[PDB]
């Protein structure tokens, strides 16, 4: 379930509370606005099989049910100290934080790491994504440290120049078109290319071409592996060997 603007529900509730002569509070919201969003969002959860069996009077037995929720909030000038934003940040399990300066820089979607995090973390992911994503977080964090050394020249250091090169290329890697979702196989393949050094030589403009061409290549020539990864999400040395073969073949053969 996606609530398009919980901010506007807070606004409407504020209005109707004021018109009903109910005592006003901080920023004119009634005292129980936190309770409004709290009891709403907390409905979203995952319930065990004994609850399901008890509710449905035995017509379903083995399954666990769930409702996951993605509420949306709008901040003003990036201020997170406002009443409603800080309420809902106290309520949820994490946040995806979207920055307008990143959007202006062309980083789209404008996810801002280090201030955007999900507490569930690994437990949510498939094994392959859990294995491959660990490097990305540290690489992007190192990129943030060495971003200061970027504009002023990096000619005075080497190992950091390689760390910066990798961080910039993975930062270039994460942008995506608005209506083109990727399957888990496609995501994991591109991430495997980035992490295991196979992008190290590619220049940034052609990284986008590299991603497009690689997806076309594997959909043409290596569909069985994509099917198995999309079904199981498993990871093995057999799978790492197949991925290595595929990327070796792509770097050897195709033009991107």
């Amino acid at each position: 379930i996606i609530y398009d603007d919980l901010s506007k529900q807070a606004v409407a509730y504020r209005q109707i509370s004021l018109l009903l002569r109910r005592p006003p509070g901080r920023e004119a919201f009634p005292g129980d606005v936190f309770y409004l969003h709290s009891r709403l969002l907390e409905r979203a959860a995952r319930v065990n099989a004994e609850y399901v069996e008890a509710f449905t009077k035995g017509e379903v037995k083995g399954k666990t049910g769930s409702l996951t929720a993605l509420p949306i909030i709008e901040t003003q000038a990036g201020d997170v100290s406002a009443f409603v934003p800080t309420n809902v940040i106290s309520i949820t399990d994490g946040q995806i934080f979207l920055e307008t300066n990143l959007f202006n820089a062309g980083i789209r979607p404008a996810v801002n790491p280090g201030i955007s995090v999900s507490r569930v973390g690994g437990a949510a992911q498939t094994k392959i994504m859990k294995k491959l994503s660990g490097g990305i977080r540290t690489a992007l964090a190192q990129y943030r440290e060495l971003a200061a050394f970027s504009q002023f020249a990096s000619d005075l250091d080497d190992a950091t120049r390689k760390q910066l090169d990798h961080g910039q290329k993975v930062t270039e890697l994460l942008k995506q078109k608005q209506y083109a979702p990727m399957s888990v196989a496609q995501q994991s393949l591109v991430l495997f290319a980035a992490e295991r050094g196979y992008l190290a030589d590619v220049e940034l403009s052609k990284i986008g071409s590299f991603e497009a061409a690689l997806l076309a290549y594997v959909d043409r020539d290596h569909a069985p592996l994509m099917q198995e990864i999309n079904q199981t999400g498993g990871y093995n040395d057999e799978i790492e060997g197949k991925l290595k073969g595929i990327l070796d073949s792509f770097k050897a053969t195709q033009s991107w």
Binding site: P23, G25, R26, P30, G31, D32, F34, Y35, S81, T86
Partner: protein, 230 residues
């Protein structure tokens, strides 16, 4: 449990939520707001909670309370009222955790107003002050190392850095609760053993055995017995 004669621990999962629940109820009843929009009874309600948690002549309640600071602002009335009641302060660090050091307590920002010779004794006071001084000097020296490498350090500086690394390793501990991960048996370390360990490491004893002998081991005797085949 106190009236039965025991010493008891009460954990409060967030004291800030108690403050905010009081604010919401006061607002619903229509009482005039105070300060930064808090209830007029803020300090009274905090005092009503905190003054029951004390040591009596039959038993005691000690309390460990999680604190959230609004807007990272330590001047806001909720932190300002809560800090009037706290005796000790434990700070957990993302950076320390990244080192592999557990628990991730920060030794330089964690403090207690029990650290005085008049209540804790001169040996414990001077030992705690000593390890604090060593770790602080180590942080400055680590900045110097970052900008100019280890070549700048004198013999005294290298001794300080080595003992600081041994101290930092020696602050780690295996929990009876953590056996699931480490597989090492948990350890409970008595205060005398801790004092002796940091006393020795500070004053140059045990300089002859490596820093990884101190990590996650336990008492200092266990550190040296780890070293013998490390």
């Amino acid at each position: 449990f106190r009236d039965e004669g025991r010493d008891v621990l009460l954990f409060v999962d967030n004291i800030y939520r108690y403050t905010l629940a009081g604010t919401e109820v006061s607002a619903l009843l229509g009482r005039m707001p105070s300060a930064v929009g808090y209830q007029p009874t803020l300090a009274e309600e905090m005092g009503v909670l905190q003054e029951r948690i004390t040591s009596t002549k039959t038993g005691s309640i000690t309390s460990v309370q999680a604190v959230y600071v609004p807007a990272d602002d330590l001047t806001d009335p909720s932190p300002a009222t809560t800090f009037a009641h706290l005796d000790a302060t434990v700070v957990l660090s993302r950076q320390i955790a990244s080192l592999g050091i557990y628990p991730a307590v920060d030794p330089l920002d964690s403090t207690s107003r029990q650290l005085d010779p008049l209540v804790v004794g001169q040996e414990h006071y001077d030992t705690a002050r000593g390890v604090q001084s060593i770790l602080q000097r180590y942080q400055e020296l680590k900045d110097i190392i970052a900008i100019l490498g280890m070549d700048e350090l004198s013999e005294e500086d290298k001794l300080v850095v080595a003992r600081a690394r041994k101290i930092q390793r020696f602050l780690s501990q295996p929990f009876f609760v953590a056996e699931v991960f480490t597989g090492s048996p948990g350890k409970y370390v008595s205060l005398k053993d801790t004092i002796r360990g940091f006393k020795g490491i500070m004053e140059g004893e045990y300089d002859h055995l490596p820093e990884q002998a101190f990590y996650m081991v336990g008492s200092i005797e266990e550190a040296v017995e780890k070293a013998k085949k490390l």
